[PDB]
Design a protein that fits this description.
Shape of chain B: globular
Radius of gyration of chain A: 32 Å
Order of helices and strands of chain B: HHHH
Strand content of chain A: under 5%
Largest sheet of chain A: 2 strands, antiparallel
Organism (chain D): Homo sapiens
Subcellular location (chain D): Mitochondrion outer membrane
Family (chain D): Belongs to the Tom20 family.
Protein name (chain D): Mitochondrial import receptor subunit TOM20 homolog
Helix content of chain B: over 70%
Distance between the termini of chain B: 16 Å
Number of strands of chain B: 0
Shape of chain A: flat
Number of strands of chain A: 2
Oligomer: part of a larger assembly
Cross-link (Glycyl lysine isopeptide (Lys-Gly) (interchain with G-Cter in ubiquitin)) (chain D): 7
Largest sheet of chain B: none
């Protein structure tokens, strides 16, 4: 019975072993076995009762269950994580991931799969490496643990052991003939993983093996990976190893200074400047036939000056902390290149700080460069768009003007991003289709916020024409929502979400100016959703006709002026005046109506249900379908 | 029967969890009486629960 | 200057919430952290406005020194002033042994150091063990700082 | 700014802290109201002031800020 199934689930959850034994006695075996083979779908998991008994370390519960009704411990089940949902193959994998040696050893004693691959082939040994329990690792390698199992992301369990400071697990694994050069999907390895996570002792433990050193997917030694973050201990250790030439060491020191220049977690100008000065002193140590860094032109938006080629130059501009950050990010960009993902996150942090310090132009230019880099890398660029609309909203709320060419450039960038989002929606099958739909919705919302911001401020006629061209291109693409709302429907509806930041100060959908901009750029006003409602239906369905009557009257006038058939009907076949739910909007639509023979005749035909099929022109057939 | 066995054993478990295994054994004895097999019901207490509660419940039931 | 170092010291060594905001205002970021890098001995022990305020129990004062200001989490100071005055104190360490659970639940959630080792290779957990605050001990075990650190005399928590 | 205003600023900071801690919010905020009016960076101080006072007290200060 379903009550028995839920009572099994509770007994395995809170460790009620006596109730579980009462379940497993005094009745039959087949039905009780089927009920204990699964739990209720609560909390997004269909996991084994043994899985949830191993989650809280109840070895007595699983032991008594196996003693009374012997079930295979390989019974799979959905298992949730902090932000991931991977369906666990066995209970001992969850025990190793939750640090419970008793359940693992009891399940092995009962006979179980030591390397039962999970959905993303997560080994129980890999789960123990994630947790860091050395006793579980020893027991599985006694029971022939599979240390060569790597994920779809090519994550061999040594990498997972090297993720955190589980140095005992790392040293025992490399003692048990591990692969210190096990490649990941993006070229990563335990060397790069410990360089990023700052486990210098794990780096020395792998140096004890010293099998080989390999580059990542973008291509750089783990010295550059250590210098990519504020992990100066690993950088100093690898420079003490000194398996590089002079110039690479100098620019690695430059990268070590640059990573500390614009990091949110830790940031000091003194250490960054000292590392830059020491790197350039090592550069000038050549003397004759001196090596020097390649000169690059200063980006007009991102920064204003090129690098410094003299020690006295940074000795003087040490007080120019902004110039120090600019030069550090410049050398970081020119070394890592546009292909590296992490080139824009310090830029994003510095732009956020500058916006906090009211350096608005610097923030806009830095974030434009970061968006350019992320789009050239073809990445997920909706979060920075949302933040960038947020900083527009904050500036407009502070009565600060914006730069119209920046508006046009970021509108073109957002149009290109919406094109990319549509391509990856229509190309993917079921991997992240829900996430892709949410991303598409967020991109449409951010584009609407950008259009509202542009209408809020004043722009030059050429910049406004370019903005109209970009919006015309995007509406020519004709974006659609989950329910089929177009851009005009999105601007019309008050149900359109607005971000909790300063966007509430500037985004007040229904916005009349946004609708006017869409109608002059040529939005398809007659377009409907999956529910059959048009823009007129949604705007007449508005519920505050008098609080903001200016916007409502302006948008009704604009919708009538651009030309929308006021008698067109939704799937339920009722007009916007029939879907008024408001006297004011009904009277406004009625005085904004327009008589027509065709509309009244189509209404009469639809009401009388005459056989309009195949007796009229086809355009008349969609005309009747409107009515 | 099973519900009465589940209710009486839970009442016995409340007294047993406070250190009074013998006091909760008397309530668990009624659970053994409510259950179809008192020996099988008390066998779960011997196998899983504390032995002092199970040993005292055998004499009470 | 050294005069402002003692001013910002008493800003957080007491519990005042506007003096550290007023004294640090209209100064460059170089000497602001220099005032927050205060390490001079006060009352027979090295003191630091982040360290002493955590001992005082004000979770608000330490939060404003880590969120809106940049301070060094690792520092040297007393952990038990009652005849021990062992150097190398942490903001979590001062709050753990003195029963300031609100400061304890805030620093670790922010990302402060959880396993700093002093000259006696001790832990904030055993400092809370002497006080007996179970919430701090439960929070430290749940956050999994360390459950096996003993002193130089192998004195288990 | 500096000079005798600076010592008047910190005096209003210290006395404003005490009365707020004591409980005299009306006199404490008014003492702090003079401090912000003579503050070197009243806008930058208000960034910290968003978290110093309780939101009722900060709103109470907000009525007396202009």
């Amino acid at each position: 019975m379903e009550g028995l199934a839920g009572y099994v689930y509770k007994a395995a959850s809170e460790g009620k072993v006596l109730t579980l034994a009462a379940l497993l006695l005094n009745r039959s075996e087949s039905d009780i076995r089927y009920l204990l083979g699964y739990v209720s779908q609560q909390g997004g998991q269909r996991s084994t009762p043994l899985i949830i008994a191993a989650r809280n370390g109840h070895a007595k519960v699983v032991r008594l269950l196996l003693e009374h009704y012997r079930v295979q411990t390989q019974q799979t089940g959905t298992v949730r994580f902090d932000g991931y949902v991977i369906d666990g193959a066995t209970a001992l994998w969850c025990a190793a991931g939750a640090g419970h040696f008793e359940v693992v050893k009891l399940l092995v004693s009962h006979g179980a799969n030591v390397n039962h691959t999970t959905v993303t082939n997560s080994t129980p040994l890999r789960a123990a490496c994630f947790d860091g329990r050395l006793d579980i690792v020893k027991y599985l390698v006694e029971n022939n643990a599979n240390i060569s199992i790597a994920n779809k992301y090519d994550n061999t369990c040594l990498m997972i052991a090297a993720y955190k400071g589980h140095t005992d697990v790392v040293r025992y694994l490399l003692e048990q003939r591990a692969d210190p050069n096990a490649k990941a999907h993006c070229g990563a390895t335990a060397l790069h993983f410990a360089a990023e996570a700052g486990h210098i002792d794990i780096v020395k433990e792998l140096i004890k093996w010293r099998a080989a050193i390999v580059v990542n997917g973008h291509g750089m030694t783990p010295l550059k990976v250590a210098a990519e973050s504020c992990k100066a201990d690993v950088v100093e250790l690898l420079l003490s190893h000194a398996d590089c030439d002079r110039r690479s060491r100098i620019e690695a020191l430059e990268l070590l200074g640059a990573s500390f220049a614009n990091d949110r977690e830790n940031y000091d100008i003194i250490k960054t400047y000292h590392y830059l000065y020491l790197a350039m002193l090592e550069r000038f140590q050549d003397g004759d036939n001196i090596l020097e860094k390649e000169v690059l032109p200063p980006i007009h938006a991102y920064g204003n000056r090129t690098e410094c080629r003299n020690p006295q130059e940074l000795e003087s501009i040490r007080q120019d902390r902004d110039a120090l950050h600019m030069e550090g990010l410049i050398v970081r960009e020119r070394i890592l290149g546009a292909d590296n993902i992490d080139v824009s996150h310090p830029i994003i942090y510095r732009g956020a700080v500058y916006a906090d310090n009211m350096e608005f132009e610097q923030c806009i230019k830095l974030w434009l460069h970061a968006l350019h880099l992320r789009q050239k890398g073809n990445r997920n660029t909706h979060k920075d768009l949302l933040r960038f609309a947020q900083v527009f909203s904050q500036m407009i709320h502070l009565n600060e003007t914006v730069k119209a060419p920046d508006i046009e450039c970021v509108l073109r960038c957002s149009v290109l991003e919406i094109e990319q989002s549509m391509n990856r929606v229509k190309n993917i099958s079921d991997a992240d289709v829900h996430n892709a739909m949410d991303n598409y919705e967020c991109n449409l919302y951010t584009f609407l916020y950008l259009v509202c911001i542009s209408t809020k401020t004043q722009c030059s006629e050429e910049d406004q024409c370019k903005i109209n061209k970009q919006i015309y291109n995007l509406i020519h693409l004709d974006p659609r929502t989950r329910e089929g709302f177009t851009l005009l429907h999105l601007a019309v509806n008050s149900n359109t979400p607005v971000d909790d930041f300063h966007t509430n100060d500037v985004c007040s959908f229904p916005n009349a100016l946004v609708t006017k901009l869409l109608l002059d750029c040529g939005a398809e006003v007659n377009a409907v959703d999956n529910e059959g409602n048009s823009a007129l239906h949604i705007i007449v369905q508005y519920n505050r006709p008098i609080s903001d009557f200016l916007t409502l009257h302006s948008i009704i006038i604009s919708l009538v002026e651009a030309g929308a058939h006021t008698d067109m009907t939704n799937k339920q076949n009722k007009t916007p005046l029939d879907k008024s739910t408001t006297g004011v909007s009904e009277i406004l639509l009625k005085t904004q109506m327009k008589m027509s023979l065709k509309c009244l005749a189509a209404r009469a035909v639809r009401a009388n249900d005459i056989n309009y099929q195949d007796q009229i022109p086809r355009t008349l057939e969609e005309f009747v379908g409107f009515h | 029967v099973q519900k009465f066995f589940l209710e009486e054993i839970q009442l016995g478990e409340e007294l047993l969890a406070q250190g009074e295994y013998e006091k909760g054994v008397d309530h668990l004895t009624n659970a053994i009486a409510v259950c179809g097999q008192p020996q099988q019901l008390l066998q779960v207490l011997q196998q899983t629960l504390p032995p002092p509660v199970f040993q005292m419940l055998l004499t009470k039931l």
